[PDB]
Amino acid sequence: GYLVGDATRGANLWNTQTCVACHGVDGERNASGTPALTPLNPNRDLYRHSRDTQDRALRDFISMWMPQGNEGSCTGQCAADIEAFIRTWHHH
Ligand code: HEC
Ligand code: NA
């Protein structure tokens, strides 16, 4: 049925699936202290990529659209886990 995302695993996949390169550690900053190349707002109810035709759940946005340039590399449980991780950011 509906996969259950694990935020702790998503914190690791954030790096290994290369999200960190474009979005920094937290959608705001890089480890180096410079601003992220592309911000990521972790608090939208739904996400609509500029090339999409409808709003998506965060995990489905990730499956379809990210990492940009190699979108098929994170789907399914990867996408669920990273969704869960991103939804922890407003507790930062
Ligand atoms: C640079 C090569 C990127 C990599 C690697 C990843 N993302 Fe990305 N992301 C990138 C761009 C240019 C954009 C904008 C897309 C558009 O609408 O044209 C995004 C957007 C996101 C968002 C939405 C952010 C928002 O504030 O609405 C999310 C949630 C997102 N990206 C997630 C994400 C994840 C989980 C990645 C690793 C699997 C990832 N991105 C990689 C550029 C790049
Ligand atoms: Na994907």
Numbering used by the authors: 1 to 92
What does the paper say about this structure?
Here we analyse a small c-type cytochrome (CjX183) present in Cellvibrio japonicus Cbp2D, and show that it can initiate bacterial CuII/I LPMO reduction and also activate LPMO-catalyzed cellulose-degradation. Gardner et al. have shown previously that cbp2D codes for a protein that is predicted to contain a carbohydrate-binding module, a YceI-like quinone binding domain, a fibronectin type III (FN3) domain and two c-type cytochrome domains. Here, we present the structure of a domain from Cbp2D, which we dub CjX183, confirming that it is indeed a small c-type cytochrome domain, with an exposed heme cofactor. Here, we have determined the structure of the isolated X183 domain (CjX183) from this protein, confirming it as a typical c-type cytochrome that most likely has an electron transferring (rather than a catalytic) function.
CjX183 was expressed in the periplasm of E. coli with the aid of the pEC86 vector which codes for the cytochrome maturation machinery to allow the insertion of heme into the protein. The red coloured protein was subsequently purified to homogeneity, crystallized and the structure determined to 1.2 Å resolution. The structure reveals CjX183 to be an α-helical c-type cytochrome domain harbouring a single heme molecule, which is covalently linked to the conserved CXXCH motif via thioether linkages to Cys19 and Cys22. Two additional cysteines (residues 74 and 78) are present towards the C-terminus of the domain and these form a disulfide bond, presumably to stabilise the protein in the extracellular environment. The central heme iron atom is coordinated by a proximal histidine residue, His23, and a distal methionine residue, Met66 in the typical configuration observed for class one c-type cytochromes. Interestingly, the edges of the heme molecule appear to be largely solvent exposed, however, the propionate groups form hydrogen bonds with Arg44 and Ser50 located in a surface loop which extends around this part of the molecule. These interactions may account for the relative stability of the reduced state discussed later. CjX183 aligns to the electron transfer domain within TsdA, suggesting a similar electron transfer role for CjX183 as is typical of this cytochrome class. Analysis of these signals indicates that they arise from a one-electron redox reaction that is attributed to the reversible FeIII/II chemistry of the heme within CjX183. This experiment suggested that in principle CjX183 is capable of activating LPMOs because the extracted midpoint potential (+193 mV vs SHE) sits below the reduction potentials that have been reported for LPMOs (typically greater than +220 mV vs SHE). The complete oxidation of the heme in CjX183 took ∼2 h demonstrating that it remains reduced in the presence of O2 for an extended period, even though the structure reveals that the heme is quite solvent exposed.
